[PDB]
Amino acid sequence: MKILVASRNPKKLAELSRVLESSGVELVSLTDVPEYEEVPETGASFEDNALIKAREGVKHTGLACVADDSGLAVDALNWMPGVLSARWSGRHGDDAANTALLLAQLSDIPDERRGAAFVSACALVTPEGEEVVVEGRWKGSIARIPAGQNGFGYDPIFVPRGGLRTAAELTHRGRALAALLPMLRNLVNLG
Amino acid sequence: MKILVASRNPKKLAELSRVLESGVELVSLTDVPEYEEVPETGASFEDNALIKAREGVKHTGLACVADDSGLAVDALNWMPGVLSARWSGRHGDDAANTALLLAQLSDIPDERRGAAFVSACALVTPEGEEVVVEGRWKGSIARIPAGQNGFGYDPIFVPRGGLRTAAELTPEEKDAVSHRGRALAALLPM
Amino acid sequence: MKILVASRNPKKLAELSRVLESSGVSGVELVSLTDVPEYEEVPETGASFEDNALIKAREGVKHTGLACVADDSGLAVDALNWMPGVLSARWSGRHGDDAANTALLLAQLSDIPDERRGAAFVSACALVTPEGEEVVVEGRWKGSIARIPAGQNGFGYDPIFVPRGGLRTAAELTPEEKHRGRALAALLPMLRNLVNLGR
Amino acid sequence: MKILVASRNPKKLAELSRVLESSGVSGVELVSLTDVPEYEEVPETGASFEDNALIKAREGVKHTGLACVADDSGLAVDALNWMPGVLSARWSGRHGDDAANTALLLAQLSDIPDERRGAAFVSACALVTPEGEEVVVEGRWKGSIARIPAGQNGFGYDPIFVPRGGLRTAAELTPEEKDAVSHRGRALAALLPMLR
């Protein structure tokens, strides 16, 4: 079966192809079908926005469509930057400017109120109109100064819960996560 | 390695073991000293799964998975939420919970009857790392119950993409919905 | 000038008249929903008294061309994600059985510890002008839900609503309460003036 | 009886004092923060002007034992999940830089179609009594965010706030017009049935 991946980034398809083995699915990207207008995204709901993108994919191709939506949710900003994460400073794709704005907005906020999460949502919409959306949230808080060089986006200022290091400072924990992650997808049982 | 499943339901632990088919021993709450389970409020299945998983770690030092599931109805500001099982005031009275929901929505037109079945799962590590995932099956609330192959709100939940209720779906129809839900859960870039 | 009040209760229009006389406004006759042709009233859902008051006022303007004031009141309970909300009066599923609404709420919350029993009585008022201006105001009286009803001088959820600042329910307050009056009588107008939208 | 106005702005007491004369409330003395010992003001987060006004009023009572009125106002934009919220005056990271706050908002909202640019000016006010009774009110003036600034008869976000019912921004409104919007807001606040 052909499934439309509502992305032009082959990195999404490559990971999705290898993850679908864990059975006859052929994945196609937006670069394989005629271009269509992409509705701009607003608000804090990664889930709603992943569903909107996935609905549009089905609408234009008649194929089942998976779409994703990811970003940063900050309690003190009412869970924004939200789906404006990549353009929070007003400038799309400028990671340093997005981070600089966030730090300045939060510059007086004590650590106890700097809670935040990295969020990633994935939606599936079928030709028959079934809708399912999933999301994952990695809990943490916003640092006061950026640290670390092994990360993109907000990694230099996102401190995962459970430590003091930022995500960009990250290189026993692997074996614990690698075995625990499957159970998180298993206890999900919508039917 | 021991992983605590924050549940006293032995069928849940057995099913979770069947998904592990790696040197991992799953332990339940009944295998560890009893502790008081704080009652749940609000609409956030994610927050409540995390609370239960944190509590498991706090009492055992083990990594802990917890789940939290129910029905979220747009017209009730995403309640019944974590009160889904006791919405009528009486825990486990599925028929009364359903009858209450219908009565609360009795004059609401189809366009505003949107709802979702939600299932959230949380992981907390001994070191305090926290991850929560949730799945949402989008649909709407029927006006009358239909079907006999379901529990809870299944007789009045109409999945988007059809007119039949969840309780009217065959077992084959129900597995195809849970296979795609778990397939999305594995795709999450995070 | 005529203003539509989106109500069938003459007492509501009487109070608005008394506020326009104590506000120093003249030449304003209020008309009710029985003074204009009947129109379909869309049922209310959700937790937002403000949004729902605005929906009702827009509809009033739509059918009459008059400025329209509408109101929307009820109970917001933290543990119910701020429901009963605009379903407060029919929380048990049937409008007008206050006793059943109150019993359902208590039963729904029966295991919730005091610290998480927070709630508020909310009252929202919206104005939409013929030109399409929209203003909405709300007031919230903070409190919590009792575990058992008490008091006999109240309707609706009053026997199970505990105002913050005491242990008594709204139904337990004496008419002389409504020393506390003089503090409220001076403070209430100050909340009204400081709502300064036009800046 | 003394009532604390949780403000250091003398204009706030005068406006409230004039309202105690129009009510006819006797024997009430208004006090400002400049008349009581200084205490730490906790920074504000989120979108709830109501919650933040209550936090400020509670703090006043805690430090003085007086009934306390406090206010909190700003801009709520649908597309930013009702932010800038209580960060309205420092939305760009710099308090009081209206040009920077407004330009950032415009930049954040570029390419957002008119139907989704909804917004509101919000003004909330809280009362907390010595006994711990809590009442909070808010008013919302509905509108949307312009694409380019216009008008000079306003500060802050006035040049890019388009009130519902017209195409002009708040900064393009005359003083006669801006007077009538606070009059209707305060008249609605007095009409609120629960205020009974």
UniProtKB/Swiss-Prot annotation, chain A:
<feature type="binding site">
    <location>
        <position position="70"/>
    </location>
    <ligand>
        <name>substrate</name>
    </ligand>
</feature>
<feature type="binding site">
    <location>
        <position position="69"/>
    </location>
    <ligand>
        <name>Mg(2+)</name>
    </ligand>
</feature>
<feature type="binding site">
    <location>
        <begin position="172"/>
        <end position="173"/>
    </location>
    <ligand>
        <name>substrate</name>
    </ligand>
</feature>
<dbReference type="InterPro" id="IPR002637">
    <property type="entry name" value="RdgB/HAM1"/>
</dbReference>
<dbReference type="Pfam" id="PF01725">
    <property type="entry name" value="Ham1p_like"/>
</dbReference>
<comment type="function">
    <text>Pyrophosphatase that catalyzes the hydrolysis of nucleoside triphosphates to their monophosphate derivatives, with a high preference for the non-canonical purine nucleotides XTP (xanthosine triphosphate), dITP (deoxyinosine triphosphate) and ITP. Seems to function as a house-cleaning enzyme that removes non-canonical purine nucleotides from the nucleotide pool, thus preventing their incorporation into DNA/RNA and avoiding chromosomal lesions.</text>
</comment>
<feature type="active site" description="Proton acceptor">
    <location>
        <position position="69"/>
    </location>
</feature>
<dbReference type="GO" id="GO:0005829">
    <property type="term" value="C:cytosol"/>
</dbReference>
<keyword id="KW-0460">Magnesium</keyword>
<comment type="subunit">
    <text>Homodimer.</text>
</comment>
<dbReference type="GO" id="GO:0035870">
    <property type="term" value="F:dITP diphosphatase activity"/>
</dbReference>
<keyword id="KW-0546">Nucleotide metabolism</keyword>
<dbReference type="GO" id="GO:0036220">
    <property type="term" value="F:ITP diphosphatase activity"/>
</dbReference>
<dbReference type="InterPro" id="IPR029001">
    <property type="entry name" value="ITPase-like_fam"/>
</dbReference>
<dbReference type="GO" id="GO:0009146">
    <property type="term" value="P:purine nucleoside triphosphate catabolic process"/>
</dbReference>
<protein>
    <recommendedName>
        <fullName>dITP/XTP pyrophosphatase</fullName>
        <ecNumber>3.6.1.66</ecNumber>
    </recommendedName>
</protein>
<dbReference type="GO" id="GO:0036222">
    <property type="term" value="F:XTP diphosphatase activity"/>
</dbReference>
<dbReference type="InterPro" id="IPR020922">
    <property type="entry name" value="dITP/XTP_pyrophosphatase"/>
</dbReference>
<comment type="similarity">
    <text>Belongs to the HAM1 NTPase family.</text>
</comment>
<keyword id="KW-0547">Nucleotide-binding</keyword>
<dbReference type="GO" id="GO:0009117">
    <property type="term" value="P:nucleotide metabolic process"/>
</dbReference>
<dbReference type="GO" id="GO:0000166">
    <property type="term" value="F:nucleotide binding"/>
</dbReference>
Curated annotation (Swiss-Prot), chain B:
<dbReference type="GO" id="GO:0005829">
    <property type="term" value="C:cytosol"/>
</dbReference>
<dbReference type="GO" id="GO:0036220">
    <property type="term" value="F:ITP diphosphatase activity"/>
</dbReference>
<protein>
    <recommendedName>
        <fullName>dITP/XTP pyrophosphatase</fullName>
        <ecNumber>3.6.1.66</ecNumber>
    </recommendedName>
</protein>
<feature type="binding site">
    <location>
        <begin position="179"/>
        <end position="180"/>
    </location>
    <ligand>
        <name>substrate</name>
    </ligand>
</feature>
<dbReference type="GO" id="GO:0035870">
    <property type="term" value="F:dITP diphosphatase activity"/>
</dbReference>
<feature type="active site" description="Proton acceptor">
    <location>
        <position position="68"/>
    </location>
</feature>
<feature type="binding site">
    <location>
        <begin position="7"/>
        <end position="12"/>
    </location>
    <ligand>
        <name>substrate</name>
    </ligand>
</feature>
<keyword id="KW-0460">Magnesium</keyword>
<comment type="subunit">
    <text>Homodimer.</text>
</comment>
<dbReference type="GO" id="GO:0009146">
    <property type="term" value="P:purine nucleoside triphosphate catabolic process"/>
</dbReference>
<feature type="binding site">
    <location>
        <position position="174"/>
    </location>
    <ligand>
        <name>substrate</name>
    </ligand>
</feature>
<keyword id="KW-0479">Metal-binding</keyword>
<feature type="binding site">
    <location>
        <begin position="151"/>
        <end position="154"/>
    </location>
    <ligand>
        <name>substrate</name>
    </ligand>
</feature>
<dbReference type="GO" id="GO:0017111">
    <property type="term" value="F:ribonucleoside triphosphate phosphatase activity"/>
</dbReference>
<feature type="binding site">
    <location>
        <position position="68"/>
    </location>
    <ligand>
        <name>Mg(2+)</name>
    </ligand>
</feature>
<dbReference type="GO" id="GO:0046872">
    <property type="term" value="F:metal ion binding"/>
</dbReference>
<dbReference type="GO" id="GO:0009117">
    <property type="term" value="P:nucleotide metabolic process"/>
</dbReference>
<dbReference type="GO" id="GO:0036222">
    <property type="term" value="F:XTP diphosphatase activity"/>
</dbReference>
<keyword id="KW-0378">Hydrolase</keyword>
<dbReference type="InterPro" id="IPR002637">
    <property type="entry name" value="RdgB/HAM1"/>
</dbReference>
<comment type="function">
    <text>Pyrophosphatase that catalyzes the hydrolysis of nucleoside triphosphates to their monophosphate derivatives, with a high preference for the non-canonical purine nucleotides XTP (xanthosine triphosphate), dITP (deoxyinosine triphosphate) and ITP. Seems to function as a house-cleaning enzyme that removes non-canonical purine nucleotides from the nucleotide pool, thus preventing their incorporation into DNA/RNA and avoiding chromosomal lesions.</text>
</comment>
<comment type="similarity">
    <text>Belongs to the HAM1 NTPase family.</text>
</comment>
